[PDB]
């Protein structure tokens, strides 16, 4: 249940497979955002294309037609602006994480990552002496839970011994007890002797596990620091107020709307479609 | 096909209808853009829901998980900002246009708009008078050419050849018919002449009549234009997220969350809970 138990390092070795996994989960996350931005872009271009044709063809004209059109232009700047978020998310961040994942993790010909197997190996190897001593100890204690039982049972047999049927039979009982009692004694010493060695062994074993562990942390710290550095970059690319000309799109929009002059427009109609027009007052044609 | 040509006032009449139509196209335009706006917002919201759960269900925990999640937080906030654009658009703008159209343009029993019929009527009036006399000139343009051509048909037979023609009386009739023809040209010209001189007076008064109604279509049209300009400025402001302090806040905040990412305290937590800093029951048994 705890890290020091044999093989309970399985977790810190898994963190490295998780390490790779997360480089993809993050790429996918960005990748999907990218499509969202380009979709909105696409929609905006479409809208402006649609409405450019409709305003040209329709009956709105003049400086109020200009103001209307202004709006399909701002859609076109916004479209370009979100389109290059896709561009930044994709060309840069995604590829940064992809290249990092190539340089940090390495698939091997018959398995997983070199990294994973290396941590998995240094762990096995720093745990090996001490796990050996452990099996030694457990076997010994079991051989001491065995002698104990048999001795106790020979002793019960003496209880059965106080049967009026016989009595070579008792002597055997006493001798059996003596040896069993003695054998309990030896197995005892063996066991506690092996337990001692395990304790000394343990300070040394403890050193080797931490050596291995602290370079698992190290590698992991690299991935964490990268996530940090890169997410700070991602957020710049998302921020459109980080763009110089964003503000200008709106300033230009405003300017175009302001220009629309109702009167300039009214004077254009009078002269081109109204009373302001040239007329050939009827004349007398001979012939 | 100049304005003054009887009935050419039709093109300025058609300007009204078109006004209502343009109001509608604008409304539609706007609505489409709203629908666009909301679609972005919504795709963001799905992205945030998706990735929040995914990040939560995955192996990144800690302060670095938090940063990634702050990321999910921004999409939603941006979505708020665009649903808000959508609302402004539909709730302010579309409604403004929709109500404006309804107070400028009134159905008339029997179809069409009371204002288009108004203009059609007054033009007609003002012209009616002058299009009578013009119809007269035209018939006197047909009087005069009739006579002239009749004269030109009567010379030729006489010349040919006469080819006899046993009589002289016939030639006399021919000469006389030519004399009738000079009479006709003469008195047809006089009439054409009277009618032409008649129009002229017609003209100054009729012209005054025409400018009177035209100006009255100008005043109506000016309204439309003025209003169009007014609304577009507003639309602009609604669409403008380049000057919204609320938006930049999204990223100040986001960035602060990414900076809160600490790789070290994330790994101080890992060894405490999953590494060497875990408590352990070292072996030390009976029965
Ligand atoms: Ca047009
Ligand atoms: Ca998680």
Angle, in degrees to the nearest 10, between helices B114-159 and B169-239: 150
- How far apart CA B154 and CA B142 sit, in angstroms, is 18
Closest CA to B183 of B136, B143, B147: B147
* Closest-approach residue (CA) in chain B for A200: B282
At A87 the three-state DSSP class reads: helix
- Enumerate residues 6+ apart whose C-beta is below 8 A from B149: none
Q: After which residues, if any, is chain B broken (C to N > 2.5 Å)?
A: 163, 284
Structural determination approach: X-ray
Q: In a 10 Å sphere around its CB, with 0-12 CB exposed, 13-18 middle and 19+ buried, how is residue B281 labelled?
A: exposed
Token pair listed for A225: 């620091």
Q: Which ligand is nearest to the CA of A69?
A: 1
Q: How far is the C-alpha of A218 from the C-alpha of B131, rounded, in Å?
A: 99
Domain B1-277 has CATH 1.20.1270.60: yes
Place of tokens 């990218």: A34
Q: d(Cα B33, Cα A57) in Å, to the nearest integer?
A: 19
Contact predicate A283/A89, CB 8 Å: no
- Judge whether A3 and A98 are in contact, CB under 8 Å: no
Distance CA(A68)–CA(A57), nearest Å, equals 13
What does the DSSP 8-state code read for residue A278?
Answer: -
Burial category of B70 from C-beta neighbours within 10 Å (exposed 0-12, middle 13-18, buried 19 and up): buried
Q: Residue A232: which of B219, B260, B99 has the closest Cα?
A: B260
CA distance B250 to A106: 37
Tokens in use for A153?
């049972």
Which residue of B22, B36, B248 is in closest CB contact with A59? B22
Contact B9, B3 (CB under 8 A): yes
What is the CATH code for A1-276? 1.20.1270.60
Nearest-Cα residue of chain B relative to residue A205: B276
Ligand 2 centre to CA of B55 (Å) is: 5
Interface membership of B40 toward A (CB under 8 Å): yes
Helix ranges (DSSP H) in chain A:
10-57, 63-88, 95-104, 114-126, 128-161, 169-238, 246-259, 262-272
What residue in A sits closest to B72 (Cα-Cα)? A29
Please tell me the distance from the alpha carbon of residue B90 to that of residue B35, in angstroms, as a whole number.
10
Q: Which residues are in the CB-under-5-Å shell of ion ligand 1?
A: A 61
Return the structure tokens found at A115: 């990294």
Cβ atoms of A139 and B285 closer than 8 Å: no
- Whether chain A has a CB inside 8 Å of the CB on B279: the answer is yes
- Please give the angle made by the CA atoms of A150, A153 and A158, to the nearest 5 degrees: 135
Neighbours of A59 (CB within 10 A): 14
Nearest chain A residue to B199 by CA distance is A282
Cβ–Cβ under 8 Å, residues B23 and B94? no
Q: Which of B220, B30, B222, B17 is nearest to A59 (CA)?
A: B17
As given in the structure block, the two tokens for residue B274 are: 């999953």
- Which chain B residues contact residue A21 at CB under 8 A? 58-59
Question: Do B229 and A137 lie within an 8 Å CB cutoff?
Answer: no
Q: Hey, which residues does B107 pair with through a beta bridge?
A: B113
Distances (CA, A) of B247 to A101, A173, B74: 33, 93, 10
For A178, the token pair is 């003596």
User: What are the boundaries of each domain within chain A?
Assistant: 1-276
Q: Please give the distance of CA A241 from its chain centroid, rounded to a whole number.
A: 28
Give dist(CA B192, CA B262) in Å, integer. 103
Give burial (CB, 10 Å; 0-12/13-18/19+) of B272.
Answer: exposed
Q: How many CB atoms lie within 10 A of CB A2?
A: 10
Query: Could you give the CA distance from residue A201 to residue A131 in angstroms, rounded to a whole number?
Result: 10
Q: Which ligand is nearest to the CA of A64?
A: 1
User: Assign residue B224 a region: left if phi > 0, alpha if psi is -120 to 50, beta otherwise?
Assistant: alpha
Listed in sequence order, the residues at least 6 apart from B25 whose beta carbon sits closer than 8 Å to its beta carbon are A54, A58
Give the experimental resolution in Å.
2.6
Structure tokens at B280: 């352990």
- For A119-130, give one letter per residue: b (16+ CB within 10 A) or e: bbebbeebbeeb
Residue B11: how many CB atoms within 10 A of its CB?
14
Query: Which three-class secondary structure state does DSSP give residue A27?
Result: helix
Give the minimum alpha-carbon distance from A8 to chain B in angstroms, rounded to a whole number.
Answer: 9
Tell me the three state secondary structure of residue A107: strand
| CB contact at 8 A, A282 and B130 | no
Preferred mutation among A195, A241, A270 to probe B, highest tally of B CBs within 10 A: A241
Q: Tokens 């007890």 belong to which residue?
A: A177
**b (16+ CB within 10 A) / e for B151-178:** beebeeeeeeeeeeeeeeeeeeeeeebb
Sequence-distant (6+) residues with CB within 8 A of A176 are A154, A157
C-alpha neighbours within 13 Å on the C-beta side of residue B123: 24
Q: Which ligand is nearest to the CA of B52?
A: 2
Mention every residue, 6+ apart, whose C-beta is less than 8 A from residue B110. Answer: none
CA geometry: angle B15, B17, B23, nearest 5 deg: 100
What gap in Å lies between CA B264 and CA B241, rounded to an integer? 38
Contact A19, A104 (CB under 8 A): yes
CB contact under 8 A, B225 and A275: no
- How many other CB atoms sit within 10 Å of the CB of residue A64? 23
Three-state secondary structure along chain B?
CCCCCCCCCHHHHHHHHHHHHHHHHHHHHHHHHHHHHHHHHHHHHHHHHHHHHHHHHCCCCCHHHHHHHHHHHHHHHHHHHHHHHHHHHHHHHHHHHHHHHHHHCCECCCCCEHHHHHHHHHHHHHHHHHHHHHHHHHHHHHHHHHHHHHHHHHHHHHHCCCCCCCCCHHHHHHHHHHHHHHHHHHHHHHHHHHHHHHHHHHHHHHHHHHHHHHHHHHHHHHHHHHHHHHHHHHHHHHHCCCCCHHHHHHHHHHHHHHHCCCHHHHHHHHHHHCCCCCCCCCCCCCC
Classify residue A116 as exposed, middle or buried by CB count within 10 Å of its CB (0-12, 13-18, 19+).
buried
Hey, is the C-beta of A287 within 8 angstroms of any chain B C-beta?
A: yes
Closest-CA residue of A relative to B207 is A275
Going B212 to B215 to B221 to B226, the CA torsion angle's sign is negative
Q: How many CA atoms lie within 13 A of B20 on its CB side?
A: 15
- Supply B207's token pair: 């012209």
Q: How far apart are CA B139 and CA B198, in angstroms?
A: 14
d(C-alpha A229, C-alpha A26), whole Å: 13
CA-to-CA dists, residue B127 to A126, A249, B55, B178, B204, angstroms: 110, 50, 78, 41, 12
**Distance between CA atoms of B12 and B127, rounded to whole angstroms?**
14
Helix (H, G, I), strand (E, B) or coil at A166: coil
CA of A67 to the centre of ligand 1 (A): 12
CB contact under 8 A, A3 and B264: no
- What is each CA distance from A247 to A90, A197, A266, in whole angstroms? 24, 75, 32
Contacts of A216 (CB under 8 A, 6+ apart): A12, A13, A15, A16, A119
Task: Give Cα separations from B102 to A120, B31, B49, B216, B232 (angstroms).
Answer: 78, 18, 42, 20, 19
The answer to whether the CB of B257 falls within 8 A of the CB of B67 is yes
Residues B148, B183: Cα–Cα separation, whole Å: 10
- Token pair for residue B220? 């109506």
**Ramachandran region, residue A136 (left: φ > 0; alpha: ψ -120 to 50; beta: rest):** alpha
Q: Nearest-CA distance from B109 to chain A in Å? A: 26
Residue indicated by tokens 């009589």: B167
> What whole-number distance in Å separates Cα of residue B175 and Cα of residue A35?
96
Length of chain A: 287
Q: A64 and chain B: CB distance < 8 Å anywhere?
A: yes
DSSP state of A244: T
Q: Is A220 on the interface with B (CB under 8 A)?
A: yes
Q: How many residues does chain B have?
A: 287
* CA B195 from centre of chain: 44
Can you tell me the distance from the alpha carbon of B279 to that of B282, in angstroms, rounded to the nearest whole number?
9
Q: Which of A3, A21, A250 sits opposite B274 (nearest CB)?
A: A3
Note which residues in 88-107 of chain B have CB less than 8 A from chain A: none
Is the Cβ pair B242, A238 closer than 8 Å?
A: no
CB atoms within 10 A of CB B209: 18
Residue/partner pairs of A215-222 with CB below 8 Å, 24 or more apart: A215/A119, A216/A12, A216/A13, A216/A15, A216/A16, A216/A119, A217/B267, A217/B270, A217/B271, A217/B275, A219/A16, A219/A19, A219/A104, A219/A115, A220/A15, A220/A16, A220/A19, A220/B267, A220/B270, A221/B263, A221/B264, A221/B267, A222/A104
Phi, then psi, of A8 in degrees rounded to 5: -85, 20
User: CA-based angle B73:A97:A99, to the nearest 5?
Assistant: 175
């Amino acid at each position: 249940d705890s890290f020091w138990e044999v093989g309970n390092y399985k977790r810190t070795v898994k963190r490295i497979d998780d390490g790779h996994r997360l480089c993809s989960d993050l790429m996918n996350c960005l990748h999907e955002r990218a499509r969202i931005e380009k979709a909105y872009a696409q929609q905006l271009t479409e809208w402006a294309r649609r409405w450019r044709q409709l305003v040209e063809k329709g009956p709105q004209y003049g400086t109020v037609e200009k103001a209307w059109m202004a709006f399909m232009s701002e859609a076109e700047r916004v479209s370009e602006l979100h389109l290059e978020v896709k561009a930044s998310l994709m060309n840069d961040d995604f590829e940064k994480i992809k290249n990092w994942q190539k340089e940090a993790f390495h698939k091997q010909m018959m398995g997983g990552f070199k990294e994973t197997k290396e941590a998995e190996d240094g762990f096995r190897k720093a745990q090996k002496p001490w796990a050996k001593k452990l099996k030694e100890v457990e076997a010994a204690k079991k051989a001491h839970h065995a002698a104990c039982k048999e001795e106790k049972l020979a002793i019960s047999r003496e209880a059965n011994s106080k049967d009026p049927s016989l009595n070579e039979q008792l002597k055997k009982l006493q001798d059996k007890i003596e040896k069993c009692k003695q054998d309990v004694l030896k197995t005892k010493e063996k066991y506690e002797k092996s337990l001692k060695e395990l304790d000394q062994g343990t300070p040394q074993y403890m050193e080797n596990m931490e050596q291995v562990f602290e370079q698992c942390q190290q590698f992991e710290e690299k991935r964490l620091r990268f996530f940090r550095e890169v997410l700070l970059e991602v957020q710049k690319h998302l921020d459109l107020s980080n763009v110089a000309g964003y503000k200008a799109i709106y300033h230009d929009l405003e300017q175009s709307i302001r220009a629309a002059d109702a009167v300039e427009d009214l004077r254009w109609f009078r002269a081109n479609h109204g009373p302001g027009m040239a007329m050939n007052w009827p004349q007398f044609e001979e012939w």
